[PDB]
Amino acid sequence: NLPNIVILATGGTIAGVETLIQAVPELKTLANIKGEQVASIGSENMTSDVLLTLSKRVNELLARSDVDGVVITHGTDTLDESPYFLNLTVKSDKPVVFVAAMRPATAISADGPMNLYGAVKVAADKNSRGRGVLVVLNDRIGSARFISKTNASTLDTFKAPEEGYLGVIIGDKIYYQTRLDKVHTTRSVFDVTNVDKLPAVDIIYGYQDDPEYMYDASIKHGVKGIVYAGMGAGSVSKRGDAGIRKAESKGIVVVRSSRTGSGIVPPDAGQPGLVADSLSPAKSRILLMLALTKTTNPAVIQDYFHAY
Amino acid sequence: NLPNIVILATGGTIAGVETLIQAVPELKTLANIKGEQVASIGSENMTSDVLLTLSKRVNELLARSDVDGVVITHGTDTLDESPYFLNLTVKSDKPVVFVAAMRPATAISADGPMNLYGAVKVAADKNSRGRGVLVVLNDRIGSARFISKTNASTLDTFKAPEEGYLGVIIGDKIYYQTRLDKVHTTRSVFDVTNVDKLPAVDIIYGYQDDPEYMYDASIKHGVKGIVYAGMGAGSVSKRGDAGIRKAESKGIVVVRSSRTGSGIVPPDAGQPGLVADSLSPAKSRILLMLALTKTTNPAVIQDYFHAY
Amino acid sequence: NLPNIVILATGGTIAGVETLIQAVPELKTLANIKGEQVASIGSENMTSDVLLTLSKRVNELLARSDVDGVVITHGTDTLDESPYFLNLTVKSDKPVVFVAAMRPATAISADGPMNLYGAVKVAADKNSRGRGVLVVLNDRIGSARFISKTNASTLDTFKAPEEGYLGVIIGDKIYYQTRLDKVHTTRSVFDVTNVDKLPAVDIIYGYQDDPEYMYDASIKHGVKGIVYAGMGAGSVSKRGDAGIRKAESKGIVVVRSSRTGSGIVPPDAGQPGLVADSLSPAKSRILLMLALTKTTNPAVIQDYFHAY
Amino acid sequence: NLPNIVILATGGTIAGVETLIQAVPELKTLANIKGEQVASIGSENMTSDVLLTLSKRVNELLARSDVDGVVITHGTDTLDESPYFLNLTVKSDKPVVFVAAMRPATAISADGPMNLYGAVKVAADKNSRGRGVLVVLNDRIGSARFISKTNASTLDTFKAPEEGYLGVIIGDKIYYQTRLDKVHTTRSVFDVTNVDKLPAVDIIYGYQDDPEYMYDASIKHGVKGIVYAGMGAGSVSKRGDAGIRKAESKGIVVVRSSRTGSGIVPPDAGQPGLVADSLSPAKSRILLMLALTKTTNPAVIQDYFHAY
Ligand SMILES: N[C@@H](CCC(=O)O)C(=O)O
Numbered sequence A, B, C, D: 001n002l003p004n005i006v007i008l009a010t011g012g013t014i015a016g017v018e019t020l021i022q023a024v025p026e027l028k029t030l031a032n033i034k035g036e037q038v039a040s041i042g043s044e045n046m047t048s049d050v051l052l053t054l055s056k057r058v059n060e061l062l063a064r065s066d067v068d069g070v071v072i073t074h075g076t077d078t079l080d081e082s083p084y085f086l087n088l089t090v091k092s093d094k095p096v097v098f099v100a101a102m103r104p105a106t107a108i109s110a111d112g113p114m115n116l117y118g119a120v121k122v123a124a125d126k127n128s129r130g131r132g133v134l135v136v137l138n139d140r141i142g143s144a145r146f147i148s149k150t151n152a153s154t155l156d157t158f159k160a161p162e163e164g165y166l167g168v169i170i171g172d173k174i175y176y177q178t179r180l181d182k183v184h185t186t187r188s189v190f191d192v193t194n195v196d197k198l199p200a201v202d203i204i205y206g207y208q209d210d211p212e213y214m215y216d217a218s219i220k221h222g223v224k225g226i227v228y229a230g231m232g233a234g235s236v237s238k239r240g241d242a243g244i245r246k247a248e249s250k251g252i253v254v255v256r257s258s259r260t261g262s263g264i265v266p267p268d269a270g271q272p273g274l275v276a277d278s279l280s281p282a283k284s285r286i287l288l289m290l291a292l293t294k295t296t297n298p299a300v301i302q303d304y305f306h307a308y
């Protein structure tokens, strides 16, 4: 008997989703596959609403006994957010594997097929359980907490220079190397099963001559949180400093992230806002949205950034 | 005798400009050194008005026969913009070497002293001429066109994964490996000699649920250009698409860059705005500002992006 | 009530051991320090005989109640071997942190002082326990299983492209991100407490026109094992294939590694010898050398390569 | 009219040479293609005598007015050697492009088809001239001087951490970014046109407890050169120092390279043998072999290592 894998489609160039089984007949030797269409939009259009629907459905399917693992086909453009959202909102140790493609299915040497094969193989493997949400492309198995799209148009784009990959897929075999040393899945305190709408969170970029009016626009629309993609280690300019303090005076929680692409944004009492640890602007937004459904205490939200 | 080098201080933790020559006595074997204080601010607060002052001063010094090269002490936070600005505005083949430090001068194993030594050595080397503006940190010699701060807090933060370094400094010797295959310095058409104020350009970030009102804020303040740090290869959401087309109808030139960190944003007739080629959002802003001093024509500006 | 850390010196430019301790007075805030001279040689002359003495000395100290961790100053040249050797021979959860320096103590911006600070900082932190042998340089905390010198002369040389670092040291604070998913230290079956002399193992490189007579030389001198630093994924030429099979007929255990620098060498029934998994030629030698002290069974040794 | 490209086949899993031309019909839009079978072997079996045949054939083809460029299908295992050999022996500015595949043609998502398309596109582009020998895989255009297989089994294996790529291929467009700053092809003094057999050169690895008898083996078999894949920056042990000096006394030229994978091996008057600059053990052997057809003078050979 083979494992039971459920493929949730959200759109992307990886694909209908029912044509894939006929195009990749090697999946038959992996597991019993059942497809399901959740959404049909590009990742660039992936919204906070669809992530709620996706997460609730994942927790419902993983609760069943006739479901061993879930493979989620998604677009590459916002694969920095999606997997990490599920990494904090899934209440099961069963494998949730995100898969995508950098080349269209009709392109020469399309990466779709092999990426899909690797994703299902990971979800059907019992050793891959309890490792947090996973992302599989280019024979790599990345952690949702660290993996991000580092290049605009290459196949090997998904990397995590400072953290590497959890494991790899070579010669039709899986090789696990490291484990995520952060709070994830079953040990997470974030439960959005009842949540209907998530708090609004903007992302403002840090740069030379950065305008203060961007922060004013976020305040006008009464957003609950702001992630600052700052220069270097979350460093603020005189205009950015004024904009952040103006937001904090309105009760808005501001988290200082970095535009660099990796590294630690350290705590600093001389600067306003909380720090994003090693979380990117995109992922810092996700954690902030979920943290705002739980509390408004700066010290508690700061704890989440150093632990999740 | 030895070459004549002028150290231009603008701020940063690497520094007063008079103390710099005292802490590193090994500089005396490299060149005859003079210092000037162009500015005294943190890189996070570096502005366009100061870059105009710096570029004009550099060109005045390099035109003199008694100046062989210049070294510019600058902060790391916006070292992505400054060197590239001068890479477009400098009118001489004489080496312009930006140098910075990731650790305070008082810290244990401060990187400043060796970085400055490496920078002065590069500026005093005759073989360093006609290579564009250089950036020297951690024994590496990078191009202003490709080098960016890839990590928020590490010593080896300045990288260019797709382009590498122009050269390295090992065992008190310079090793050049590659040359910049783009337009720069003496062949550049950008001139700010008679410029008092440059056209304003903002950078808007791309992410899930990205607000269209950020573009409205840029429009209301009459910016001449907008750089979009897009999802993946500069992909726009439904809200981002509407915000861009609204900006274009007001005469605002928009260029689609990427939040990924590297790679090519390819042309696409299905999306609005121009494409940033391999230019990062920070460097795209700098090039756009200078491009807007010569023309507003989309085709001519697009050509600049594929050539500079 | 500060932790008790003992510093064991073996050699390298980072180093007597007494002169270093007082050169970094910031160590006093970390823990109580005591130094011991195990050896005084460049790492290029480090031998398996000295590793036996070092591993036993470490085990004596880690058995004591008045010792919380050990810091080992070593050279960078063979820092690929040493730490991994103790990762299999140390029988304690207490932190064993290897440290080195790429620049001499007298050089401008020497890295030693900070590297030593980080090493002691890590060895004194109770959260460092049970993570295997650690290697600390350039604000990084790498696993002895993955970390290696990737560059001949740079400060940031120690990297692990496919696995990243276990953690980083930023702003006088430790940030752990990953855990080694391999058998190490306390769970290790390798015990050299009563071993006086380790089996001899040679490393033979793979390349175009590689001679078979190198394998004949290993056989003639009676080595117990041979590590093949093969082309690509351990691919053997006509001459390498013949040499390996000739060694196997004499009882020599051969393991196929890779000259590439990273990646998996997959099992192949068409080629002779065992496979090194993701272990480098240097680390494969250390493991094979320890595996030969227990068994000569090809099946048992092959499994050591997939678990350790 | 379309350019005239000749595809030379030597072997590899990417491939009958006429079988591939039919497998990728998109090649017809690039250029007029002809195929020749130079050899049919796995790159692990590539030898210097075949390189002589290949180089001599490439030179006579490029000398023809009806040939605009050459694409060479090859295996990945020794793609570190071959391209660099031709980088020193080709007497034409016309593009010589090596291409390979990490996955067999029959595998799912085989990279072969796209790599070949990229290779032909590069060879057919007139702007590819005067850039030295090129290597095209995974949408990247690497220099024969820097590019190497950095991973045993991944598609993106071919990288050059410190130098990057000469250009990239995105959206059916070539983007040249850097140019090789070394002597190559047309300006190279190495000519093997009238060479029937090349000097024998061995590569000896550096590690803890490295045997001196490996050097004795090379001496006994009368090699003309020895490349030392040394520890760190070409560091020798007591045994390695004695072996190298012993070889030098027999008139054998020894070059100290590095097992690290990248970086500069600096000159050192305290150690024996010449230094490899930034050349890897694989590429160092190729240069030494070619240099030995012209001279045995250590100074001249050392100069080749810093220039080529
Ligand atoms: N804009 C598309 C790109 C195609 C893809 O990478 O999946 C998306 O993100 O869905």
Ligand SMILES: N[C@@H](CCC(=O)O)C(=O)O
Pocket (backbone or CB within 6 Å): A232, A235, B011, B012, B013, B014, B041, B042, B043, B044, B074, B075, B076, B077, B078, B100, B101, B102
């Ligand atoms: N915010 C400071 C950091 C110190 C430095 O990088 O020099 C600056 O960029 O100037």
Ligand SMILES: N[C@@H](CCC(=O)O)C(=O)O
Pocket (backbone or CB within 6 Å): C011, C012, C013, C014, C041, C042, C043, C044, C074, C075, C076, C077, C078, C100, C101, C102, D232, D235
């Ligand atoms: N050969 C010396 C290099 C200096 C160092 O890196 O410590 C050693 O490895 O000990």
Ligand SMILES: N[C@@H](CCC(=O)O)C(=O)O
Pocket (backbone or CB within 6 Å): C232, C235, D011, D012, D013, D014, D041, D042, D043, D044, D074, D075, D076, D077, D078, D100, D101, D102
């Ligand atoms: N041993 C084969 C591997 C397959 C390939 O890379 O083409 C070769 O190098 O030719």
